Amino acid sequence: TDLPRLPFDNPDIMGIAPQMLALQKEGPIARVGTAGEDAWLVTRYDEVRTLLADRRLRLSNPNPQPSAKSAARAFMVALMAGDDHETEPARHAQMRSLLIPRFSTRRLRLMKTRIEHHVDELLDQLAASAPPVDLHRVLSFRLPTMVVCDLLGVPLADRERFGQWARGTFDQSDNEHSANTFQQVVDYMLELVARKRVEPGDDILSELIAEKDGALSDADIAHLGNAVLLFGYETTIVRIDLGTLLLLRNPVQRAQLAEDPGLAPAAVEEILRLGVGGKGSNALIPRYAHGDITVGETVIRTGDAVMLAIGAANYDDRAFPDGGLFDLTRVRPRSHLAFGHGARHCIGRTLARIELTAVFERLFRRLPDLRLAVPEESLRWQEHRITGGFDEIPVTF
C-alpha cells in the first residue's frame, strides 16, 4: 500500500502520467494525496462525465474550516462565482445567464470571418520571417488575444498590456504576484466599464451595461469582464501550441490535413481530446461533494474533495478505441471532455472551436515544412500556472 500523490510525474511533454493510466486500469475512482487535502481521483470517461453532470458535486467548498488555497486558485474560483457555497447557486446561475447570450450566432459568424483573415495575415508574417521563429509568440499568442480585444471592444495593442495577466493571476507559486496582477486586471476592467458607459460599441461590456436595463452594477459587470479576459485567451493559446505539437508528432495525419482542410474540425476535436501537457494538472477539474455520492462501490461523502480527470478520461480506451492515438479519421467519436460537461460547461467553447479550426485549416498548408527548431524535451510545461502551457515554441519552416 502506497497512497498515490498528485501531481504524478510524466516522462513525456504531453499525454497522461503513467501512474494515472495505471489507476484508470484498476478502476474508476481512487483516493489520492495531493499538495493539499486528500481527494477522490476519478479517471474513467463514463464516471467523469456522470459526475460532471451531478448537481451534488460543485465548485464551491461547503466545509466549515476550508483548507487554504493559493491566491491564484481563490481568484479563479471567485471569478466562477464559487467562492461562497451559500450563494453559488444564484450567483452561478446569473453568471451563465448573463454570459451565454454574449456569444450569439450573429457575433460568432462575424468573428469567424475576422478570425480567418487574421490567421491569414499572421501566417503571411510568419512565412516572410527568417527561422528560427517562436511560433508561440507570433501565432498562438496573437490570435486568441486578438479575439478577446474584439469581444471587449478595445484596440488590439491593449493585448500587449493584458497578455500576461492570466498567467500572473493564475501563478500558484507567488501569492503576492498573483494578487498584484489581479489588481491590474480589476483596474483595467473598471476603466473599460466606465468608458463603455459613455462610448458603447458592438461588444460584451456594452451589452451588459444595457442589460435589463442598466440594473447591473459596474462591479458586477467588471466581474463578468474579468472572467472573459482571464478565461478567454490563455487556454486557447495553450491548445494552439498543443495542437501544433501533436500534428508535428503525426506526419501522416498532418499531411492529410494539409491536403484537405475540410478535416480541420475533426483535427480540432482530436487536438482538444489529446492535448494535455506536462503533468496535466489543468486537466483535473476540482469539485467538492455537497451530498453523498456513490461511484461504483465507493461512497464520496459530503465535504470530500473530488478531482475529475478530464484528460485521463479523454484518453480512456473504454470511450475512444486506441485512446492514445491521434486519429482524425475516427468515425463518430464520443464527445470529449476538454471543455467540461454539465453545469459549468465552458461558455466560450464554440468560439474556441472557431479559432482552432481557422488556425489548423491553414497552418500546414501555408507552412508545409514547419517543424520544431529545438528538441521536444527542451520544451518546458509551466507547472506552477493553473493554465499550464509552454513559454515558447521555436520552429523552422
Binding site for ligand HEM (CB under 6 A): 59, 80, 96, 99, 227-228, 231-232, 235-236, 239, 285, 338-340, 344, 346-348, 351-352
**196 vs 344, beta carbon nearer ligand HEM:** 344
Instruction: Report, in Å, the least distance between residue 59 CB and ligand HEM.
Output: 6
**72 vs 338, beta carbon nearer ligand HEM:** 338
Chain-centre distance for alpha carbon 49 = 17
**73 vs 384, beta carbon nearer ligand HEM:** 73
346 annotated as belonging to a binding site for a ligand: yes
Instruction: Report, in Å, the least distance between residue 44 CB and ligand HEM.
Output: 17
Instruction: Report, in Å, the least distance between residue 99 CB and ligand HEM.
Output: 6
**205 vs 228, beta carbon nearer ligand HEM:** 228
375 Rama class: left (phi>0) / alpha (psi -120 to 50) / beta: beta
> Which triple of cell numbers denotes residue 205?
461590456
Instruction: Report, in Å, the least distance between residue 276 CB and ligand HEM.
Output: 10
**74 vs 373, beta carbon nearer ligand HEM:** 74
**Do residues 274 and 314 lie in contact, with contact meaning Cβ atoms separated by under 8 Å?**
yes
| Alpha-carbon span 35 to 37, nearest angstrom | 7
**162 vs 231, beta carbon nearer ligand HEM:** 231
In the bound state, the residue with its beta carbon closest to ligand HEM is 348
Instruction: Report, in Å, the least distance between residue 1 CB and ligand HEM.
Output: 31
Instruction: Report, in Å, the least distance between residue 137 CB and ligand HEM.
Output: 19
Q: Assign 3-class secondary structure to 205-260.
A: HHHHHHHHHCCCCHHHHHHHHHHHHHHCCHHHHHHHHHHHHHHHHCHHHHHHHHHC
Please name the residue that has the C-alpha cell 451534488: 56
Instruction: Report, in Å, the least distance between residue 285 CB and ligand HEM.
Output: 5
**266 vs 347, beta carbon nearer ligand HEM:** 347
| Alpha-carbon span 138 to 21, nearest angstrom | 35
**Do residues 396 and 126 lie in contact, with contact meaning Cβ atoms separated by under 8 Å?**
no
Instruction: Report, in Å, the least distance between residue 298 CB and ligand HEM.
Output: 21
Q: 170 vs 60, 115, 181, 255, 348, CA distance in Å?
A: 18, 27, 9, 37, 19
Backbone angles phi, psi at 365, to 5 degrees: -80, -40
**246 vs 285, beta carbon nearer ligand HEM:** 285
* Bridge partner list, 394: 134
**Do residues 323 and 316 lie in contact, with contact meaning Cβ atoms separated by under 8 Å?**
yes
* Bridge partner list, 171: 385
Q: 149 vs 145, 204, 229, 351, 380, CA distance in Å?
A: 6, 10, 9, 14, 28
Instruction: Report, in Å, the least distance between residue 158 CB and ligand HEM.
Output: 15
Beta-sheet strand order (sheet of 284-289): 29-32, 39-42, 305-309, 284-289, 57-58
> Which triple of cell numbers denotes residue 45?
470517461
**44 vs 92, beta carbon nearer ligand HEM:** 92
Backbone angles phi, psi at 224, to 5 degrees: -65, -40
Binding-site residue positions: 346
Binding-site residue positions for heme: 346
